[PDB]
From Swiss-Prot, chains A, B:
GO terms for molecular function: all-trans-retinol dehydrogenase (NAD+) activity; zinc ion binding. This is Alcohol dehydrogenase E chain. It is found in: Cytoplasm. Its EC number is 1.1.1.1.
Length: 374, 374
């Protein structure tokens, strides 16, 4: 029916930064060779989407953001093998071409075909598949999930369990997988250890989930929003700290609390200052600190190199270290097998048209994850 | 004979920074319980000793510097069970009390009894065993090897093979073990990988030895002093680069010649800029950079945290990551079994009286490691 035809549908377009998303009627071109058109079912609102609006994260505008979602394959372009119409799929913002040096490496997951380092806002052939009022609109991370339909590259999609709850498993497109793997895969949190997690939003709580599943003996959640505490305890935190309650720095407090420093700390906010503090918090001779938060564009932090010379380790990771195509489908199965829970991350469900309301809840600090249903 | 009595001997005293060492007569008190008095046989000139002179490295003055050496036990205090008079020993600038958290940790080596973080320049009891011109002189890292005799705590001394050439194994006291351990133990260089080593002095060449030992396929030596290249090629470097020969920044040059970045890079100079540069030139998704050089006191570096977010790992280490008391004797044995060569690092051998000429050879870039003999 729609196959081979330009679809006219609704999409939330961001024309200028610091503006609300305007639901517009856009024309989604049919998938070219090796591309896949997807009908969106559920998409989550991640902080990185808000960074685009805030101007924190620079990307070509106008653009259709959205990168955490799950849908159904409508049509596939010429050459597509991995999926076919009717398939349930999760678009992957970190592709997996399986051909570059990174994809061929045992532990790298930052595929060279990504559109993150230097965003272009186009398809692999450098063109867009979205038009609004005769004006081409940019893609976002090769995903652009804030649209009833979207076109992604074959390398940027994973087929998932046909029986999976699309309205929940969408969290596996970013938030969950990022948090879980940051603790489990990047930091490789050990049993009995003490962990510190700065930022208790969807991604942070998923970090706590990873730490808890890794058998962490102590998991101290850190946030300036106390209303996050109860939910944090719920998913694993053993204690929660609000930096506003003290007269001394949180690094001093956390070091005193942990008797010399934590074993693993995670920065899940996106602030330069909290990135340094998370480093300082870990034990000087063997602590490990992982940056999960996305920093403001072009900002450089300053730190004393002696923090590392004593023995600390500092690393970062996109998508929790998971090779997208390989991991997403297996992560979904683990969900179907009740190996972990996504339910505590979802605080609100709203229809797609109410996206702006969904971003205000996040900015207000009233929600963890809001899922948008089409 | 001299046991239980003060000893009058010569030692190189640094009264004020940026001044030459004064070879003078000092009185070395007898060892107290759990202390050991050593007759120095050989001591190498490490750049960290030069940092004390320059004021780059802050420690209480006046002081008797020196930390890379080998000697013989003259007498032991009460309770000393690990060594005995006549034993060949290597003083350890990084101790191993074996009781603290770090000591108990399987990975940590930065013993909490160290005198590196908050240098107070005394013995573990708060006192000094040195007197010069009637005044008490400070110890340095609990070692102070630029003296014919010295007293160190038992947790700061390791008994070595009685047949070892002290004029050589002294390098295991710092330069060699640090360079070699950084590659082998800290970075954990993989077989077939590409490494870049910044700084080709005594410790840097030891990193090259460790990289070659771990099985690195390509080891690029980076130094502004082309006179070091030959010796570097001699110990393992496959190519040597001099930033001066290029019209383009070194990180681009290295990235281009490595086809997107090295797997492992090491900063073995002690500069804020080369530390960030070394980080930059390692592959963004899986590269690891190890800081080995000592930075100037109280100086912060500036960097973009996005360098870490893509997946890079940054770490630093003291004494090559080795738990000191456990490792040094094994390192000496391996040397005895011809597992590695120290000869290539020794360019000059001078008697203790020519310490100042020794520091000039280093500053001039004329020597790699100069060993002073007593
Ligand atoms: N590395 C990746 O692949 C990846 C993936 C997903 C999200 N992110 C980034 O992770 C960060 C968090 O995303 P989220 O979706 O969980 O966000 P969120 O907005 O739900 O949560 C951020 C949390 O940090 C707290 N916070 C803010 N400032 C704080 C401070 N100064 N001190 C202590 N706590 C503070 C907030 O109250 C909030 O609870 C964002 O920067 C996002 O862009 C990165
Ligand atoms: N972490 C530890 O445990 C430990 C142990 C020993 C030494 N160190 C430190 O390691 C560093 C090296 O010590 P070393 O004894 O081998 O010193 P070294 O003086 O022999 O110096 C190494 C090299 O750095 C080179 N260099 C200087 N500036 C350069 C630049 N801008 N670019 C490229 N090359 C440059 C010099 O030409 C020299 O060849 C020092 O900072 C020292 O204090 C640390
Ligand atoms: O070379 C080892 C070394 C020293 F001696 C110091 F004094 C110091 F502070 C360091 F950090 C070192 F690595
Ligand atoms: O949430 C993941 C994420 C994004 F969407 C971005 F746009 C980005 F640049 C990141 F670095 C992210 F981690
Ligand atoms: Zn996200
Ligand atoms: Zn790839
Ligand atoms: Zn040294
Ligand atoms: Zn100890």
């Amino acid at each position: 029916s729609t196959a081979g035809k330009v679809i006219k549908c609704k999409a939330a377009v961001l024309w200028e930064e610091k503006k609300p998303f305007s639901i517009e009627e856009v024309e989604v071109a049919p998938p070219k060779a090796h591309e896949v058109r997807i009908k969106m079912v559920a998409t989550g609102i991640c902080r990185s989407d808000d960074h685009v609006v805030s101007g924190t994260l620079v990307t070509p505008l106008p653009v259709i953001a959205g990168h955490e979602a799950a849908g159904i394959v409508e049509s596939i372009g010429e050459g597509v093998t991995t999926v076919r119409p009717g398939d349930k799929v999760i678009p992957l913002f970190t592709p997996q071409c399986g051909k570059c040096r990174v994809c061929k490496h045992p532990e790298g997951n930052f595929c060279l075909k990504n559109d993150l380092s230097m965003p272009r806002g186009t398809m692999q052939d450098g063109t867009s598949r979205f038009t609004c009022r005769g004006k081409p609109i940019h893609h976002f991370l090769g995903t652009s999930t804030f649209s009833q339909y979207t076109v992604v590259d074959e390398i940027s999609v994973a087929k998932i369990d046909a029986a999976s709850p699309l309205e929940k498993v969408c969290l596996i497109g970013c938030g969950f997988s990022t948090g879980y793997g940051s603790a489990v895969k990047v930091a490789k949190v050990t049993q009995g250890s003490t962990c510190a997690v700065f930022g208790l939003g969807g991604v942070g709580l998923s970090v706590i989930m990873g730490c808890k599943a890794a058998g962490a003996a102590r998991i101290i959640g850190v946030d300036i929003n106390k209303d996050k505490f109860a939910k944090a305890k719920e998913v694993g935190a053993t204690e929660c700290v609000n930096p506003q309650d003290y007269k001394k720095p949180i690094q001093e407090v956390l070091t005193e609390m942990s008797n010399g420093g934590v074993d693993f700390s995670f920065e899940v906010i996106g602030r330069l200052d909290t990135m340094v503090t998370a480093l300082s918090c870990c034990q000087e001779a063997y602590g490990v600190s992982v940056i999960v938060g996305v920093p403001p564009d072009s900002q450089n932090l300053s730190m004393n190199p002696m923090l590392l010379l004593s023995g600390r380790t500092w690393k970062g990771a996109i998508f929790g270290g998971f090779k997208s195509k390989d991991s997403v489908p297996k992560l979904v199965a683990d969900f179907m097998a009740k190996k972990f829970a996504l339910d505590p991350l979802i605080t609100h469900v709203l229809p797609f048209e109410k996206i702006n309301e969904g971003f205000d809840l996040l900015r207000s600090g009233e929600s963890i994850r809001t899922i948008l249903t089409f």
